[PDB]
Amino acid sequence: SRVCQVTGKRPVTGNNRSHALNATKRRFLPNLHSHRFWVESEKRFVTLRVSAKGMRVIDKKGIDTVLAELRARGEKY
Amino acid sequence: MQVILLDKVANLGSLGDQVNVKAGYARNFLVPQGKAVPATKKNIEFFEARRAELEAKLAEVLAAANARAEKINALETVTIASKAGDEGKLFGSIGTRDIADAVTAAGVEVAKSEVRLPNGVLRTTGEHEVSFQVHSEVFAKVIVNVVAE
RNA sequence: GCUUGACUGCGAGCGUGACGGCGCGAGCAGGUGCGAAAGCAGGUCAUAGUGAUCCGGUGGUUCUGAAUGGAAGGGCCAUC
RNA sequence: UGAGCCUUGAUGGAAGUGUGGACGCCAGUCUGCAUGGCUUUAAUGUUUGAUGUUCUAACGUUGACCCGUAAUCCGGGUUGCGGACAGUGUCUGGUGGGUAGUUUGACUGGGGCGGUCU
RNA sequence: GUUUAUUAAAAACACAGCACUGUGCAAACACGAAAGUGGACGUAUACGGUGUGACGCCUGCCCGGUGCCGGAAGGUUAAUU
RNA sequence: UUUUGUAUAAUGGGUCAGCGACUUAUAUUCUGUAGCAAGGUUAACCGAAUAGGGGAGCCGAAGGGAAACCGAGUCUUAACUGGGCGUUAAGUUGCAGGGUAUAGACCCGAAACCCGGUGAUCUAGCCAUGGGCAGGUUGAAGGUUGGGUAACACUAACUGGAGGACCGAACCGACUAAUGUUGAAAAAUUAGCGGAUGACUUGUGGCUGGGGGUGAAAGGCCAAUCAAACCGGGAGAUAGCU
RNA sequence: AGGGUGACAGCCCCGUACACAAAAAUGCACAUGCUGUGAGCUCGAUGAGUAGGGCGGGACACGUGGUAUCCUGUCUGAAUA
RNA sequence: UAAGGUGAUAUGAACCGUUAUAACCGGCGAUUUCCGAAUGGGGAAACCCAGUGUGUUUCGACACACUAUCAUUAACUGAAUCCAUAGGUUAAUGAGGCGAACCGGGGGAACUGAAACAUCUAAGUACCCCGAGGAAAAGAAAUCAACCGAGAUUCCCCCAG
Ligand SMILES: [Mg+2]
Ligand SMILES: [Mg+2]
Ligand SMILES: [Mg+2]
Ligand SMILES: [Mg+2]
Ligand SMILES: [Mg+2]
Ligand SMILES: [Mg+2]
Ligand SMILES: [Mg+2]
Ligand SMILES: [Mg+2]
Ligand SMILES: [Mg+2]
Ligand SMILES: [Mg+2]
Ligand SMILES: [Mg+2]
Ligand SMILES: [Mg+2]
Ligand SMILES: [Mg+2]
Ligand SMILES: [Mg+2]
Ligand SMILES: [Mg+2]
Ligand SMILES: [Mg+2]
Ligand SMILES: [Mg+2]
Ligand SMILES: [Mg+2]
Ligand SMILES: [Mg+2]
Ligand SMILES: [Mg+2]
Ligand SMILES: [Mg+2]
Ligand SMILES: [Mg+2]
Ligand SMILES: [Mg+2]
Ligand SMILES: [Mg+2]
């Protein structure tokens, strides 16, 4: 479901609008890559379909901090 | 990405030091394996003391007991005989295994392993310089008096 | 031969156009040229030699300028 | 290997005696290595850009195992392989009747052709 | 053999044979936003695409133009800095 | 009706009876008419609801200049001249009508374009599983014996039974003519005709869905529809034409 | 008011204004009971992958325009009264 | 509430009533087959088959009840692997589907107009999809104003074509 999962960044729509300004309904899908995060504490290697930058989050706002939430919302985890 | 080292690590090791690194190294190796910890502040600006409990507290005023320095100066006179005789000479010798045990019945006691002496005075009788230094820095002084049985 | 009137601002009143426009213009103001002088000169003997608006470009200007002073930008005049 | 920093030279302990380098407008002189009565330009420390190697630890695996599981899917684990490559996101040059929307004037002794639009 | 069911059965299409070209396998390619699937439970004596059309004797000259294949040393050149 | 022009052999109407096309809203400008007048008038809203209150605001009594600004003047200009636009114009608010704007804008009518659904009981390919092919003919390969060979080739007779093989019912198809053409029939009947063990033919069910499918390819077939199916919407598409 | 009754009825009938009517069931207001909720008093704390920025788009009447402001797919990324 | 009644085409029949529920009007409950979210499994809708209990029984066979899925929680279990998770079981509570318009959100046309047509318009309209309520959304300034101040949101009339 091409979803950030960690931030929710979903694919938005738009227009390629080539030169001369021409309607070309397209879409912008997240980076995403899915990783193998080492919770360490829980001693588990939970793999999440995280998106670029959205990763910088786990590496900044905290792993189990994020894993905390997402798990509170009732997401896979 | 800073993170504090925790062991080896090539061109950046200190078993405990903060060095700028790439996130591609952390959460990928430097960490997931037990070799570092992010600059979560909670381990730096809140662990500064912890990561400094051997200098700012120890190595600067560490008086745990290193008072055995000058400690020796006013005692029962460090007169350690050595059996004298023969036209005014001696018999045995005095060095360490005598100055230290000297404080046997004196309750206290010093370690013959803690002293200072350039060379070794031959057979004489003059006060020795068996200075009892509790620690390299804070040393002391100790004498010897080859008495007669 | 001497020159820059191929000037600037306006214009009684006319001609020709459905209109946008276009042509003729004596004379008035300021300042020029030529002539002794009256006077002539607002491009060529005349009728072809041509592009509207928009969007912009360059110069000028206390016209304007979103809290105020500025500025960008906008208007006006010249011009591509 | 470029570029950088500027960290160190060159202008701008005792003589002699020799051993490689320097551009010179040369008849040079220098420059170090042993023996012996601030610019102008290069090296180490360093930073960053280039290409190229090697590694593992992301990442791939439509190799082999183990459990879920008397399952061919899938997930987790093990091992091998490959490995910052491949792949994907955003941006970007090329290509692109495969596809899509349109255009492709008027006069005209019918239309077209020819010619003509001021 | 096939074909315009309802005006054309043919000299049309198809064929076996031929050549060219692509494809090393998670194949090329095709359907599909993706997962996945056909190709194929096949592996270059295989599969796809194109053109020719049994068989016999053959298949000449042209690479200037367009396409495609190889080189990319140099000239011009995108985002970016 | 349409036309320069129609009895026109140009259009439309069998006839009758009923229905059938310049409306509606808001705005703007006039004409008429009513109210008030240098003033006219309210909006929403309130409401002892068609009153009464509310004058937010709108138009008008001033205009010129691109404006700043000025002002019965103001611009243009250096110009205290001329010239342009102004000054000696009553407006305003209803109500009825004419006209315009925005709306489907008198009415009926395309061929098409887009969006979402429904269809492979017809037909085109395919997948799975079953069925059909009277009779008659030809005679390949291979084998057996004789011959033959140094052994093989080779050869003859018999055997054997292949083939998008032959003749021909069923069956599948559809080359010719006639008849039919308000048919018996929205493609057939009759007399001939082509294939008929094959790329054959058929029952049953399944899978491919519209710019997509399927196609031994004709633009053919996708339910009597196909150079883009059918149904429902956008939708009163649009129609300088009739 | 209206309707019906053998033609058009205030007084024939049903109604009509007006006046009352609830075992029970519930909308709604209040009123309170139980549980859950937590008042106010001082001392505090005051929303970071965020605001901004580069790229591509979109929304703002506003077609990038000299164009603020808002949202972001992609890359970054601060102050902290 | 009452002298009349057993709905209609529908009479007839056979009956119930006349003080006091006969009928009839409303409140509340009972029953409420089978299909249909359909929920035990399956399926061409209204049908075919099953398990575990229960029952009758001179206790067979057959009636009846519960058995979908997901989710939150609790309990018991429990792999690769010591632990540990994964997974399994059970229980309870909730969801599921139906809807007329209005509403919030995700996606989003063309005809048309521009007297052609790409910018532009049509229009964020038609349509599709998810979600919620009697309303929804919105809402207590990182708002405007302009040196005076106003004071969350929402709807109306002006500003003004
Ligand atoms: Mg001339
Ligand atoms: Mg085309
Ligand atoms: Mg169009
Ligand atoms: Mg023409
Ligand atoms: Mg044939
Ligand atoms: Mg035909
Ligand atoms: Mg035929
Ligand atoms: Mg051919
Ligand atoms: Mg041929
Ligand atoms: Mg040839
Ligand atoms: Mg005529
Ligand atoms: Mg006429
Ligand atoms: Mg006639
Ligand atoms: Mg009639
Ligand atoms: Mg045959
Ligand atoms: Mg026949
Ligand atoms: Mg035959
Ligand atoms: Mg069938
Ligand atoms: Mg429409
Ligand atoms: Mg119509
Ligand atoms: Mg059931
Ligand atoms: Mg079921
Ligand atoms: Mg048009
Ligand atoms: Mg204030």
Coordinates of C-alpha atoms (C1' of nucleotides) and ligand atoms in Angstrom, one line a residue, chain F residues 163-168 195-198, ligand 15:
Chain F
rG163 C1' -1.2 -41.0 -45.9
rG164 C1' -3.5 -32.9 -43.9
rA165 C1' -3.9 -40.0 -50.0
rC166 C1' -8.4 -41.4 -53.8
rC167 C1' -14.4 -42.1 -55.0
rG168 C1' -18.4 -41.3 -51.9
rG195 C1' -13.9 -31.4 -47.7
rA196 C1' -15.3 -36.0 -45.5
rU197 C1' -8.9 -39.9 -40.3
rG198 C1' -8.2 -34.4 -40.6
Ligands
MG15 MG -8.2 -36.8 -47.8

